[PDB]
Amino acid sequence: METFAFQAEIAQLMSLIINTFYSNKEIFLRELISNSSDALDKIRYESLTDPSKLDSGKELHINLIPNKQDRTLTIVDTGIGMTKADLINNLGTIAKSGTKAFMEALQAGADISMIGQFGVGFYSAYLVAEKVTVITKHNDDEQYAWESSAGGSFTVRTDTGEPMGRGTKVILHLKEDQTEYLEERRIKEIVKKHSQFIGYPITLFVE
Ligand X SMILES: Cc1nn(-c2ccc(C(N)=O)c(N[C@H]3CC[C@H](O)CC3)c2)c2cccc(-c3cnc4ccccc4c3)c12
Which residues contribute to the site for ligand X (CB under 6 A)?
Answer: 6, 10, 35-36, 38-39, 42, 77, 79, 82, 86-88, 91-92, 95, 122, 134, 146, 168, 170
Closer CB to ligand X, residue 168 or residue 195? 168
Question: 96 among the known binding-site residues?
Answer: yes
Q: State the nearest-atom distance from the C-beta of 47 to ligand X, in Å.
A: 15
Q: Is 86 annotated as a binding residue?
A: no
Q: Tell me the residue ranges of DSSP E strands in the chain.
A: 2-5, 62-67, 72-77, 129-137, 144-148, 153-158, 167-174, 202-204
Query: d(Cα 119, Cα 21) in Å, to the nearest integer?
Result: 22
- Nearest distance from residue 12's CB to ligand X, in Å? 12
Q: Which residue number has the CB closest to ligand X?
A: 92
148 or 181, CB closer to ligand X?
A: 148
CA distance 176 to 148: 17
139 is in an annotated binding site: no
**Cβ closer to ligand X: 170 or 182?**
170
Contact indicator for 31, 128 with CB cutoff of 8 Å: no
Q: Between 68 and 163, name the residue whose CB sits nearer to ligand X.
A: 163
Burial of 2 (0-12, 13-18, 19+ CB in 10 A): exposed
Q: What is the DSSP letter of 140?
A: T
CA atoms within 13 A on the CB side of 60: 18
Closest distance between ligand X and the C-beta of residue 91, in Å?
4
Which segments are annotated as binding site?
35, 77, 96, 122
Which segments are annotated as binding site for ATP?
35, 77, 96, 122
